[PDB]
Every structure is written in C-alpha cells, then in structure tokens.
Amino acid sequence: KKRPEDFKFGKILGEGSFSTVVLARELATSREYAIKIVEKRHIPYVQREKDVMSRLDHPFFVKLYFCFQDDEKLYLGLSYAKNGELLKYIRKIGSFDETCTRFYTAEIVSALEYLHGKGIIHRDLKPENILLNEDMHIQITDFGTAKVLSPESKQARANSFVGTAQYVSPELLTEKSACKSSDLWALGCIIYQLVAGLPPFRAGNEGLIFAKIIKLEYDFPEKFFPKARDLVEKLLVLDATKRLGCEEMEGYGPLKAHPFFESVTWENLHQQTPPKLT
Numbered sequence: 287k288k289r290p291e292d293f294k295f296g297k298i299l300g301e302g303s304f305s306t307v308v309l310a311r312e313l314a315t316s317r318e319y320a321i322k323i324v325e326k327r328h329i330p331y332v333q334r335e336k337d338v339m340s341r342l343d344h345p346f347f348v349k350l351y352f353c354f355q356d357d358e359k360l361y362l363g364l365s366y367a368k369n370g371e372l373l374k375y376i377r378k379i380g381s382f383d384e385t386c387t388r389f390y391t392a393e394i395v396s397a398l399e400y401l402h403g404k405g406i407i408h409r410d411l412k413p414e415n416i417l418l419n420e421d422m423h424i425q426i427t428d429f430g431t432a433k434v435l436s437p438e439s440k441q442a443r444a445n446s447f448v449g450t451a452q453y454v455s456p457e458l459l460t461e462k463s464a465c466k467s468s469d470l471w472a473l474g475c476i477i478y479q480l481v482a483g484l485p486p487f488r489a490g491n492e493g494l495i496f497a498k499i500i501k502l503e504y505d506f507p508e509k510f511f512p513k514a515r516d517l518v519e520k521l522l523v524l525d526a527t528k529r530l531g532c533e534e535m536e537g538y539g540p541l542k543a544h545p546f547f548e549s550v551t552w553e554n555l556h557q558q559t560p561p562k563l564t
C-alpha cells in the first residue's frame with residue numbers, strides 16, 4: 287500500500303463537488319499520476335468508482351493504478367490525462383471538422399462497445415467526462431455514478447437517478463431507470479455538440495431541458511455533415527430499444543457499419559495518430 291509521503295504533490299488539476307484532483311510525482315519511480323482526493327469527514331460513490339474502474343482495462347479509459355487512505359482522506363491514483371477535457375477543445379475551436387468529428391466519435395463508440403461488453407452503463411457520458419491524454423486519444427472518466435449490471439440476473443435496467451441534464455436519457459426521466467442504450471442517447475448528444483458547437487437540448491434551467499428531451503424537441507443547423515446528421519437521428523430516438531448500437535438492434539456491428547464511419551479502421555484506433563483539431 288502506497289502512502290501520501292510516497293508522493294510530491296504539484297498543482298490542482300480540478301475540483302469536484304467533494305473531491306480534488308492533484309498532479310503528483312511518485313518519489314521512488316518518478317512517475318506522474320493524477321491523484322483524486324476525497325475528504326472522509328465530508329462514500330458509496332468512491333467505492334463505486336473503485337469497483338467499476340478496477341474492472342476496466344482498455345486504452346480509452348482513465349486507469350486506476352492504486353488507492354490508499356489516511357484518517358482524513360481517501361486517495362485514488364489515476365493516469366494523468368495531460369490535455370484535459372474534450373469540452374475545452376469544443377469551446378476553443380467552436381466545432382470540429384468532419385475528420386475530427388469522425389475520429390473522436392469512433393473512439394467513443396469503441397470505448398462504449400468495450401464498456402457495454404462488460405455489462406457496465408456509464409450514465410454520465412459528456413464532453414467534460416471525456417479527457418485527453420498527451421497523445422490526444424480519449425480517456426473516459428467519472429465512474430462513481432456508473433453501474434455494473436448483474437450477470438447473475440441478466441439485469442438490464444439500473445434504478446439510481448444519476449446523470450447530467452443535457453445528456454440524460456428520456457427513459458431515465460420518464461421510466462426512472464437507465465440501460466446501456468442510455469449511453470447511446472448521450473453519444474448522439476455528443477456527436478451533435480461536436481458538429482454544432484452546443485448540445486441539442488438547451489435551456490437556462492433543467493426542467494426546460496427535460497421537457498425538450500421527452501418530446502424530442504431539437505433541430506439541426508443548416509450546415510451539418512449529412513451522414514453525421516443521419517447517425518444522430520439514429521441515436522436520438524425516444525424508444526431505447528431502437529437506437530443504433532443497442533442490444534435490441536443487434537449491437538455495435540451495425541453502429542460501426544454506419545456510413546459516417548466508412549473510412550474508419552476500428553482495429554488499433556488507439557495506435558493511429560489523431561487528426562489535429564485546427
């Protein structure tokens with residue numbers, strides 16, 4: 287078990303509702319980590335984050351390397367995503383060209399195929415939770431609100447009410463449960479945001495967003511890559527059993543076969559050089 291004194295802490299990388307992420311160098315190895323620190327006095331979320339991430343082993347996810355605790359804090363040692371949030375780049379450039387939209391959408395699809403293959407729902411997929419490593423490949427994070435579906439019971443629905451209003455699925459709002467397909471709804475919101483520069487359901491307060499989501503009230507700007515618009519229209523479907531990529535639609539094969547992805551080589555995506563964003 288590692289201890290606080292094993293590290294030299296540097297700058298704060300970010301802060302959550304009740305967590306702080308700090309850049310740290312391990313003295314004995316000289317390795318850099320992002321260490322997420324939670325105050326104890328301020329817990330199933332930390333445990334859930336631990337349990338879910340301990341199960342993951344794919345290049346498109348932040349890795350959990352170690353954990354420890356002292357009387358005051360819980361520490362999670364994570365890989366450092368040097369380039370930060372995908373959201374920063376969307377806001378910086380305003381929107382992504384077709385090549386970049388395609389590449390990053392493909393990486394998210396690949397990541398979700400892996401995650402869903404393990405029977406795990408993310409439930410809070412959004413650009414803020416898609417980080418970028420030094421090589422500009424994605425590193426999905428924020429698993430404290432993810433759910434491992436029980437294989438013993440062939441569980442499909444998760445009952446915890448979690449998410450972010452702009453990306454939350456209509457089934458969680460209306461039926462009070464989410465499923466793997468709920469992440470494909472979020473994917474469609476993210477692809478839309480990459481191209482249009484804002485997510486599709488927008489308002490100055492959450493209730494107004496919920497009202498639009500449940501009615502599928504959104505529009506495309508006049509210029510939007512046509513095959514990408516088709517893909518978004520096959521993801522933003524109210525009926526969770528009718529989204530391209532979902533189990534009832536026969537899984538990731540048909541999604542990866544969408545015309546928007548025609549030029550994608552799905553194998554070794556993580557070994558390709560990402561396209562420059564501008």
Ligand SMILES: Nc1ncnc2c1ncn2[C@@H]1O[C@H](COP(=O)(O)OP(=O)(O)OP(=O)(O)O)[C@@H](O)[C@H]1O
Nearest residue numbers: 299300301302303305306307320348364365366367
């Ligand atoms: N592995 C990482 N590498 C680099 N930066 C990170 C890493 N993990 C988190 N961060 C940064 O720290 C911020 C806070 O992370 P944390 O997961 O502790 O809280 P959060 O869940 O994002 O915040 P909230 O609880 O308010 O939604 C993130 O938004 C991100 O910018």
Ligand code: NA
Nearest residue numbers: 302410428431
């Ligand atoms: Na969060």
